[PDB]
Structures are given as C-alpha cells and as structure tokens.
Amino acid sequence: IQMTQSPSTLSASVGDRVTITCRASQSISYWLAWYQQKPGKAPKLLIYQASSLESGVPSRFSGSESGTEFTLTISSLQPDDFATYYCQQYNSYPYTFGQGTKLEI
Amino acid sequence: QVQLQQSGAEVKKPGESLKISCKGSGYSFTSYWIGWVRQMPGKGLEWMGIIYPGDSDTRYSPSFQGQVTISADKSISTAYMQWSSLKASDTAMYYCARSFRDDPRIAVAGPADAFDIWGQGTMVTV
Amino acid sequence: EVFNATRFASVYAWNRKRISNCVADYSVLYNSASFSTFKCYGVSPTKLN
Amino acid sequence: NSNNLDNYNYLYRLFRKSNLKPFERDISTEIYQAGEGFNCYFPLQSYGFQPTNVGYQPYRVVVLSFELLHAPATVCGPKKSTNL
Ligand SMILES: *[C@@H]1O[C@H](CO)[C@@H](O)[C@H](O)[C@H]1NC(C)=O
C-alpha cells in the first residue's frame, strides 16, 4: 500500500495554519498512527488509533481522519513546528509508513 | 526507567554471521508486545520481520522469510537479531521496539502497540 | 494416595483408577505450597467443592 | 456482524463478589481471589482477537434500552401528524 504525502516542501511562516494530506487506499478505519521525528532522533508517537493524543507532545498538534483520507492539521503554528512528520497504519498487517516533507525558509 | 538498550554501529562484509543487542530494562518484558520496523538510511521504511519473544514465535513477512532471525534470552533480557549471510540490501539503521499501552496498561499490556521507547539506536549496516 | 501421593507413573502408562465413595477435599490443593502451580480450566478454582 | 469492522484490547471480568444489578457499571483492577502485588493480580482478561486472527472472531453488540416511563416525550418516531 502506497502512502502519499503532500506537499514535499511546505513553506510556512510563524503562525501559519498549514495542512498535509496523508491518503490511504483501503479500509484502515480503526487503527492508524502518527509519528514526529527530529533531525537525528527517534520517531516519537503523535496520534494512535487516529483519534487519541499521545503523551509528551504539546497539545497544539492534531491529526484528522476522514474515511480512507487523513490530514495532519496544525491550527495554531509554533515557531518550533518546522519539522518532518510521517504516517503509519496499524489496522492491518503489514504496517507501512509515509513519505515525509522537508520545511525550508 | 523503561529503556531499551540498543547496540552500536558496525561495518562488515557480506556472508558473515552477526548478533546484535536490544536490552530491555526498567519494565516488564514478558508483558509487553514487541513490534519490529526497519528504517533504510535516508529513505522509506520496511517491516523486516517480527517475532514473539514470549515463546520465540517466529512470524516473518513473506518477502522476509529466513533473512533475519530474531532471538531474546530472558536471562540477560536482551533481544538479538541473527544473520546467516549478510546482504548489502539490508545496510540501514535498525530500530527494535516495545509496546505502548494506553488503555489499562497493567491489564495485559500485550499486543498493544509497537513504539514505546528506544535507546540510542543500532544502525546495522548489513 | 493421589493428592498427597509419593510416586506416580509415566506418560504412556497412564492407568485409570476408579475410586468410589470419596470426599473431595480441595482446599489443601488450592492452598498447597508443595505444588508450585495451580492452573485450573474446567471450572472456577474457588468453587471446586 | 462486526467481524469485518471489529485487537487484544477488550477485557471481561472473571472474579467478583456477586452479580451486578441491572445496568451496573463497576470498575476495579486488582484483588484476585487467592493467587495485592502477589500472585493475585488483575481480574479481567484480554480477549483473543488479533488483526491476524467463526465463534472466536470479534463481534460487536449494542443495546437500545427503551425507557417507557411516563414523562414529557423527547425522542419520537417519524410519524407525520394531522389536524385534530
Ligand atoms: C497433605 O499434606 C500436607 C503436607 O503435610 C498437609 O498439610 C495436608 O493437610 C495434607 N492433606 C490432607 C487432606 O490432610
């Protein structure tokens, strides 16, 4: 299953509400996970089962789901939000990840 | 302190036998699920193969039958991955994972998730 | 001769002993320390009596 | 049939003092019968459903408790009214 992420580069300024699209192919309704990774660090859980917030991350981050379509939406951007995010479905084996996006100035 | 001690970096030649280290400490190892995800360096990720270290129940993906053989001795409580013939296609940064529990963590804690906490990471250049 | 028994048999020589007119004291087995494991399937271990 | 819709995250009680009253909601996570942190441990048991796993397959059941108490009606059926 191929996971598409858009856009590859998302130029945003401080406070800009930006959204990225993470679309799936078939029914993974219940179990879907999201992760955040810093340069040279291990990916940390963001949202598990596509509807629950994981501990350790500021509550400003939020993930949305709509059937087979899923969107990571940051409503109130922070100056430290410029990073890369990935996807993961865990409803059906095997588990596949997303592509990722780099944020430039 | 729930921790999973990963081993260090390595540079080898194909064909050799290898054993890496994933030492879980500061939690209940027999109660947690153990998920597996491998990360190629600079690109996407692929499930290399999963085992149930509770009873060494081997369940590998069809595309990864026999390529990696994971083990875990409960004596020292460290998870090993074995190789019988190193391949250039598997040079990457490996991440062995425990299970995260959010709903009644003490109920069973098994088959819950596949990302709880990782050590410094064993970048296994196979 | 079965609960506090001394000697037992092998796996392939399992013989049936039809004992009659018995009194099933199960509290000793339920609280036994000489027996390390008491894993019970068919009914509840507390209502064995 | 929730087999396609709805994995070890479902618990059910095995040991308790007695049966619960109709629609009772009791929650406790310790104090097994015989064998606090001893062999006696968590009393509920996780169901054996798994994404890799007929009667042993996961289902889901819901109940619509209809209360016929004499009270001002709030939830009514799709019946079209007429002039009296
Ligand atoms: C079986 O032996 C134990 C150990 O001596 C003893 O405590 C127990 O009472 C015995 N069983 C019965 C039924 O007396």
Full residue range of the structural domain in which residue B13 is found: 3-124
Q: Which residues have a Cβ under 8 Å from the Cβ of B104 and sit 6 or more positions away? A: D11, D29, D44
Q: Tokens 């408790």 map to which residue?
A: D65
Is beta strand B10-11 parallel, antiparallel or unpaired with respect to B3-6?
Answer: unpaired
The structure tokens listed for D8 are: 């070890």
The secondary element (H helix, E strand) that includes residue B69 is strand B69-73
- As separate numbers, helices (DSSP H) first and strands (DSSP E) second, chain D gives 0, 2
Q: Where are the domains of chain A?
A: 4-97
Residue A49 has φ and ψ, to the nearest 5°, of 50, 25
**Residue C31 Cβ contacting ligand 1 at under 6 Å:** no
Breaks (C-N over 2.5 A) in chain B follow: none
Task: Check if C45 contacts D (Cβ < 8 Å).
Answer: yes
d(CA B107, CA D44): 7
The residue contributing the CA closest to ligand 1 atom 7 is C28
Quick one: which of B97, B41, B125, C39 has its CA closest to A40?
B41
Experimental structure resolution, Å: 3.8
CATH of the domain at B54: 2.60.40.10
Q: Tokens 């179990």 map to which residue?
A: A31
Please answer yes or no on whether D35 and C38 come within 8 Å at the CB atom: yes
Residue C47 has φ and ψ, to the nearest 5°, of -105, 40
- Identify all chain D residues contacting A30, using CB atoms and an 8 Å cutoff: 5-6
Torsion of CA B118, B24, B15, B47, to 10 degrees: -50
- By CB neighbour count within 10 A (0-12 exposed, 13-18 middle, 19+ buried), where does A44 fall? middle
Answer left, alpha or beta for residue A99, where phi above 0 means left and psi between -120 and 50 means alpha.
alpha
The amino acid that residue B110 corresponds to is G
Quick one: which of D28, D55, D54, D58 has its CA closest to D43?
D28
* End-to-end CA separation in angstroms for chain C: 19
Nearest C-alpha in A relative to D6:
A30
Q: Which residues have a Cβ under 8 Å from the Cβ of A94 and sit 6 or more positions away? A: B47, B61
Query: How many inter-chain contacts (B to D, CB under 8 Å) are there?
Result: 26
Instruction: List the determination method.
Output: cryo-EM
User: Which CATH entry fits the domain spanning A4-97: 3.40.50.2300, 3.90.1720.10, 3.40.50.300, 2.60.40.10?
Assistant: 2.60.40.10
The amino acid that residue D45 corresponds to is Q
Is the bond into A7 cis (omega within 30 degrees of 0)?
yes
Please answer yes or no on whether A42 and B61 come within 8 Å at the CB atom: no
What A64-68 contacts at long range (C-beta under 8 Å, 24+ apart), as own/partner pairs, is: A65/A32, A67/A29, A68/A23, A68/A24, A68/A25, A68/A26, A68/A27, A68/A28
Q: In this structure, are residues A63 and A46 in contact, taking their beta carbons and an 8 Å threshold?
A: yes
The three-state secondary structure class of C28 is: helix
- By CB neighbour count within 10 A (0-12 exposed, 13-18 middle, 19+ buried), where does A28 fall? buried
A9 DSSP assignment = B
The three-state secondary structure class of B89 is: helix
Q: Which residues have a Cβ under 8 Å from the Cβ of D13 and sit 6 or more positions away? A: D43, D44
The three-state secondary structure class of B14 is: coil
Is the bond into B111 cis (omega within 30 degrees of 0)?
no
Structural domain count of chain B: 1
**Residue C35 Cβ contacting ligand 1 at under 6 Å:** no
Q: Which residues have a Cβ under 8 Å from the Cβ of C35 and sit 6 or more positions away? A: C29
